[PDB]
Amino acid sequence: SAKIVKPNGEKPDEFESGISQALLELEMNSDLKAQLRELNITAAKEIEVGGGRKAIIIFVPVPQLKSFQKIQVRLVRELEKKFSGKHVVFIAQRRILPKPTRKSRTKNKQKRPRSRTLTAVHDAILEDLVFPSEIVGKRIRVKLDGSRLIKVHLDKAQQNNVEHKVETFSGVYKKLTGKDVNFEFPEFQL
Amino acid sequence: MQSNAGEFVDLYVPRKCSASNRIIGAKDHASIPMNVAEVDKVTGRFNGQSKTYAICGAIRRMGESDDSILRLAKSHGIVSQN
Amino acid sequence: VRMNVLADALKSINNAEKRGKRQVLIRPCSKVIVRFLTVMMKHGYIGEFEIIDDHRAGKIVVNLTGRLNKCGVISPRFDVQLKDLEKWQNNLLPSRQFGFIVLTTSAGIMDHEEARRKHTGGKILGFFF
Amino acid sequence: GRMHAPGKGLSQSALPYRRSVPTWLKLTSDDVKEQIYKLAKKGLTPSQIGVILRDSHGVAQVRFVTGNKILRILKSKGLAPDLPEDLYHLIKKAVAVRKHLERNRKDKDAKFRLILIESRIHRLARYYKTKRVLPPNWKYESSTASALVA
Amino acid sequence: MPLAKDLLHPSPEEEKRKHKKKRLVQSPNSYFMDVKCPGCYKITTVFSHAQTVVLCVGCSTVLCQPTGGKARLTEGCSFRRKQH
Amino acid sequence: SGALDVLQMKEEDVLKFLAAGTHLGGTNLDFQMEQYIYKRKSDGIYIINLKRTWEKLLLAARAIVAIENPADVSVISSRNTGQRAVLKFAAATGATPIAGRFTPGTFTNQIQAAFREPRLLVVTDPRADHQPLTEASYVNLPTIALCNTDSPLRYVDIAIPCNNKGAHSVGLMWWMLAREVLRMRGTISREHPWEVMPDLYFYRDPEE
RNA sequence: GCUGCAGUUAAAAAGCUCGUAGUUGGAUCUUGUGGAGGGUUCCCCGCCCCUUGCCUCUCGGCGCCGGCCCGAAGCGUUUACUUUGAAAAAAU
Structure with missing residues (x-):
């Protein structure tokens, strides 16, 4: 559809509806339909950067996330021109849980999986933003003010795929987590 | 060191060496100040105001001072890329 | 091990x-x-x-x-009840004026100077000065 | 280090940080499963199974092309053995020692080494049996050693 | 030691010639290889430390040999890593 | 270096370094001499970098300038090769030579008549003149010397690498040392040929 | 000699190993913003998903205009620890 393809996220909203309409339209069009197979989102959002530019966010149901990773570049290329003047990235949405060891009340409902934990989700989110580099290293530094800056060593191949997205990816993570990240390319590759 | 008045006490305030960040006593005769001469750096002729350093006996006697004196001049001049 | x-x-x-x-x-x-x-x-x-x-x-x-100058550990981890405190800090510090015994409390990990203002005893971990 | 020798040594495997596919590969999750099931028929046990995949087939390991271990895949079928191969290989060794010991009563060295391998069985058994992986009445004896290895 | 040396960022192989579990990140010292000699015209992929005989489906029926470490190949080139 | 090319090593001096074999350095190494070396040949001999030699020459020489008295920068050498070289050094530039055997206690006595209190030292070869180095650390003397690959560093603040196993490497290096101090302090500056040469800082060398 | 000892030669590590009790045991499961108390962010209500976890209700008050809202009732898997109360004969 074009309005009920965003459940659990509130179906009316102007910008989000205007994305969905022309999105599913491309998938229905015969121009590409041999790798597009009528998937749907669950929400969307637009978030800026201090670079003075906007960038769009696409959420998915997450078992469907795997299929998006198949095409991921051709699709994003076409929608980079179709929605132009903004950057385009996929991401996934999880139903993160408070601890039973206590941040909200437990009833002995279930164990709480450690993939449904908080910290594992914030690691998994980073894996998708810079998916085509396939993160080589992670390092962290701690400041005298108790802040933290998270270095990410990326592969030294597939550089220009991410090099004009390099700053705009960092602003995404800020809005989702509350944390500051930097992206680097290392001295050497093994 | 301060008091109630903030009045400064201690007969001498000792000096604290550059690459070890520790203080050298009244008797300690392997601790050396080492004066490097600056130049104008337009003609390469001596010009007055010196760079002065200080090194403790502990790093001297083990043979680590050579690196420390090099690094001190490496964070300033004259050393570019060694 | x-x-x-x-x-x-x-x-x-x-x-x-x-x-x-x-x-x-x-x-x-x-x-x-x-x-x-x-x-x-x-x-x-x-x-x-x-x-x-x-x-x-x-x-x-x-x-x-x-x-x-030195940071040490104190093991095993004993309890403190904010009257045992003065006895500990005398033995473990060079002076009253400075030095910091560390401990953990239910209000988190902190120095002893902070714990006294929150009225929290707890388990001692180490020290430094 | 070593648990019945004085030695110390490193030879442990070291895995990469990465863990993609990586890219270059084939045989979707499902393909790997049927490739495994054939091997277990032939008497190839889980340790051997991963080797024979890693050496000649395109896998790095069967934990990044599946969401499960090699053993859990076999266990979900019901085709897993009734005791771990680890325990089996200990018991497998000690019977031949006891044969050699009956044939030669003057090999005190063998008698000594048997005490180690014997006690190492009992320790291992006390892991599994507390975890409800063995019956809480099973014991190790000469008789039960003979029958359980056959 | 000169007793001031960096440990954050190491040299490409003058401080990565060390033992593999004494590095900052643990790396293998092994690699795969894409082969395809003639004795067996197929694009086979094989691990460097074979540990077992790799068989051939052609006229030949042996490709490798497991020694005390890497594996001695044969009279067939076929080489790559690739990447790792 | 510091100033862009009015202190940096010229094309001329490179020939002198290579003709005197300064670049070559002995088989044995120390762990304080690792950085100064670049690499080995295909044979036992390890090739000192000449860029790294040149930077160490400068602040070494600049420290000899930094004193306001040139009569108390006491140079010392006791090897035969380093006798003739130092004698011209401390004759040309105001300094005090101590040639041959040291005769210990001359930096800690009040009864000896050769007692002196200098500020700096400039020594050839730590392992011939180990005696003055030990006594330097009893009366707070800064110290400079010429190290080789196999000469250890201990009671020295700065090194000036060299081949220095008894060669033209020795006399060339003492000449260059005296050249630099005059470019900063003296009126010899112009940095185009000085009248005095390194052809009399070289060894006596018993003649026919 | 717990705080606080010692065991190469001064008094002193079982010849050696296995082994139950006892003692001891790796890493890993949440952070930012307005008001209030204190600085120039940081430490009683809330907000992103959570915020003293829930409901379900019904009996006895508080409301607002039959209808609707929120305190008390079961509790957050269990303990140690720590903090606050209660209860502790006099003399010393």
Whole structure:
């Protein structure tokens, strides 16, 4: 559809509806339909950067996330021109849980999986933003003010795929987590 | 060191060496100040105001001072890329 | 074995500072070591520190200065009840004026000077000065 | 280090940080499963199974092309053995020692080494049996050693 | 030691010639290889430390040999890593 | 270096370094001499970098300038090769030579008549003149010397690498040392040929 | 000699190993913003998903205009620890 393809996220909203309409339209069009197979989102959002530019966010149901990773570049290329003047990235949405060891009340409902934990989700989110580099290293530094800056060593191949997205990816993570990240390319590759 | 008045006490305030960040006593005769001469750096002729350093006996006697004196001049001049 | 991780950690940075160094490598990275060194950094005895990440447990690297004289561990972990405090801190510190016994309380990990203002006793971990 | 020798040594495997596919590969999750099931018929046990995949087939390991271990895949079928191969290989060794010991009563060295391998069985058994992986009435004896290895 | 040396960023192989579990990140010292000699015209992929005989489906029926470490190949080139 | 090319090594001096074989350095190494070396040949001989030699020459020489008295920068050498070289050094530039055997106690006595209190030292070869180095650390003397690959560093603050196994490497290096101090302090500056040469800082060398 | 000892030669590590009790045991499961108390972020209500976890209700008050809202009732898997109360004969 074009309005009920965003459940659990509130179906009316102007910008989000205007994305969905022309999105599913491309998938229905015969121009590409041999790798597009009528998937749907669950929400969307637009978030800026201090670079003075906007960038769009696409959420998915997450078992469907795997299929998006198949095409991921051709699709994003076409929608980079179709929605132009903004950057385009996929991401996934999880139903993160408070601890039973206590941040909200437990009833002995279930164990709480450690993939449904908080910290594992914030690691998994980073894996998708810079998916085509396939993160080589992670390092962290701690400041005298108790802040933290998270270095990410990326592969030294597939550089220009991410090099004009390099700053705009960092602003995404800020809005989702509350944390500051930097992206680097290392001295050497093994 | 301060008091109630903030009045400064201690007969001498000792000096604290550059690459070890520790203080050298009244008797300690392997601790050396080492004066490097600056130049104008337009003609390469001596010009007055010196760079002065200080090194403790502990790093001297083990043979680590050579690196420390090099690094001190490496964070300033004259050393570019060694 | 490596029964107590924190107890093996401090001896490295103690040994390293004596010889004259300013970078170290301490493993295997417990969360307990992080919040310890955070408190120890605020007061100013060490500089900023970098946590390397591995899947195994991580590794941590520290930048330090000669301001530190010695940080020790006290094991096993005894309780304090804010009248036992004065007896502990006398034996373990060079002076009343400075030195910082660390401990953990239900209000988190902190120095002894802070715990006295929150009225929280707890389990003692180490010290430094 | 070593648990019945004085030695110390490193030879442990070291895995990369990465863990993609990586890219270059084939045989979707499902393909790997049927490739495994054939091997277990032939008497190839889980340790051997991963080797024979890693050496000649395109896998790095069967934990990044599946969401499960090699053993859990076999266990979900019901085709897993009734005791771990680890325990089996200990018991497998000690019977031949006892044969050699009956044939030669003057090999005190063998008698000594048997005490180690014997006690190492009992320790291992006390892991599994507390975890409800063995019956809480099972014991190790000469008789039960003979029958359980056959 | 000069007792001041960096440990954050190491040299490409003058401080990565060390033992593999004494490095900052643990790396293998092994690699795969894409082969395809003639004795068996097929694009086979094989691990460097074979540990077992790799068989051939052509005229030949042997490709490798497991020694005390890497594996001695044969009279067939076929080489790559690739990447790792 | 510091100043862009009015102190940096010229094309001329490179020939002199290579003709005197300064670049070559002995088989055995120390762990304080690792950085100064670049690499080995296909044979036992390890090739000192000449860029790294040149930077160490400068602040060494600049420290000899930094004193306001040139009569108390006491140079010392006791090897036969380093006798003739130092004698011209401290004759040309105001300094005090101590040639041959040291005769210990001359930096800690009040009864000896050769007692002196200098500020700096400039020594050839730590392992011939180990005696003055030990006594330097009893009366707070800064110290400079010429190290080789196999000469250890201990009671020295700065090194000036060299081949210095008894060669033209010795006399050339003492000449260059005296050249630099005059470019900063003296009126010899112009940095185009000085009248005095390194052809009399070289060894006596018993003649026919 | 718990705080606080010592065991190469001064008094002193079982010849050696296995082993139950006892003692001891790796890493890993949440952070930012307005008001209030204190600085120039940081430590009683709330907000992103959570915020003293829930409901279900019904009996006895508080409301607002039959209808609707929120305190008390079961509790957050269990302990150690720590903090606050209660209860502790006099003399010393």
